[PDB]
Amino acid sequence: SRFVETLVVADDKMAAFHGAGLKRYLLTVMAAAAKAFKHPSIRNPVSLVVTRLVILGPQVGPSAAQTLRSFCAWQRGLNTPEDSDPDHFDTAILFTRQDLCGVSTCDTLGMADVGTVCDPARSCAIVEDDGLQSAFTAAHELGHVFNMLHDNSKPCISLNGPLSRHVMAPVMAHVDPEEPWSPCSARFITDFLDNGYGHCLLDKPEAPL
Ligand SMILES: C[C@]1(CNC(=O)COc2ccc(Cl)cc2)NC(=O)NC1=O
Ligand SMILES: [Ca+2]
Ligand SMILES: [Ca+2]
Ligand SMILES: [Ca+2]
Ligand SMILES: [Zn+2]
């Protein structure tokens, strides 16, 4: 049994748009993401548990990289040193209505650092809330936090075989409901946990939302 104690943050733009329904919306999005992380195709399921919810702070702008870095610096200040403190969280995810962009286009919907889930200085993800598929983007970004690569990467070719229908496709496409995670994704999270990088995921949270 593994539990990810999750801080969910929504910016002022999320509050402006969603209003009174924002909390319920965020919990609905996170419930759908949590469902993906329990699917047997992941090989080593984890329970994504919302433990803290902040409605706004960090500097949010078009640059996905800058927004991720600002958010990740800011979230550190909310955390506590020890995982046994009930206020401690294992990962931080920001939802924003800001159109996040890369170097040349604004097609990106989110960003996360890779393989950082039990590093409180780096366990961070951002998601552009599209209003419908935000749970899939959240799952993709959290996949990265769990050390997953894209399914068209060189290592995934040999793990997935010759025969873009998974969460870790590089761009959103229709996800296979019987296999949201590719064999590559399953292998990478499994290795990550087997190698001890999920050492902060063993304590069970007292007060889930
Ligand atoms: C740059 C970019 C662009 N991709 C996205 O923003 C979102 O990608 C997906 C979302 C949902 C699903 Cl199901 C599949 C893919 N950011 C990122 O984290 N990896 C990337 O290559
Ligand atoms: Ca804890
Ligand atoms: Ca965008
Ligand atoms: Ca923990
Ligand atoms: Zn990605």
> How far does CA 141 lie from the centroid of its chain?
4
> Could you give the 3-state DSSP secondary structure of residue 105?
coil
Residue carrying the six token digits 């040999």:
158
The residue whose CA has the least distance to atom 21 of ligand 1 is 170
- Catalytic status, residue 141: yes
Length of the chain: 209
Three-class SS of 51-73? EEEEECCCCCCCEHHHHHHHHHH
> Could you give the 3-state DSSP secondary structure of residue 82?
coil
Pocket of ligand 1 (CB under 6 A): 102, 108-111, 136-137, 140-141, 144, 167, 169-172, 175
CB neighbours (10 Å) of residue 40? 11
- Helix (H) or strand (E) segment spanning residue 172: none
With the most atoms of ligand 1 within 8 angstroms of its CB, the residue from 108, 116, 124, 175 to mutate is 108
Beta bridge partners of 50: 6
Q: Which of 19, 41, 38 is nearest to 30 (CA)?
A: 38
Helix, strand, coil share (%) of the chain residues, nearest 5: 35, 15, 50
Residue pair 68/29 in contact (Cβ under 8 Å)? The answer is no
HSE value, Cβ hemisphere, 13 Å, CA-based, for 206 = 6
Catalytic residue among 141, 178, 179, 206: 141
Helical ranges in 54-133 per DSSP H: 64-76
Q: At what angle do helices 134-145 and 22-37 cross, to 10 degrees?
A: 50
Cα–Cα distance, 10 to 126 (Å, whole number): 10
Beta bridge partners of 125: 93, 112
Technique used: X-ray
Which domains can be identified in the chain, with CATH numbers? 1-209 (3.40.390.10)
Q: Where in 129-186 does DSSP place strands (E)?
A: none
- Helix (H) or strand (E) segment spanning residue 157: helix 154-160
> How far does CA 200 lie from the centroid of its chain?
16
Rg (CA), the chain: 16
CB neighbours (10 Å) of residue 208? 12
In this structure, which amino acid lies at residue 23? K
The order of strands in the sheet holding 91-96 is 47-55, 3-10, 91-96, 124-128, 110-112
The bound ligand whose nearest atom lies closest to the alpha carbon of 164 is 1
Residues 6+ apart with CB under 8 A from 33: 48, 135, 138, 139, 142
Q: C-alpha dihedral over 12, 47, 149, 135, to 10 degrees? A: -40
The residue whose CA has the least distance to atom 2 of ligand 1 is 108
The bound ligand whose nearest atom lies closest to the alpha carbon of 87 is 2
Structure tokens at 97: 């209505």
Q: C-alpha dihedral over 75, 117, 100, 60, to 10 degrees? A: 10
Cα–Cα distance, 196 to 84 (Å, whole number): 18
Residue carrying the six token digits 């690569």:
149
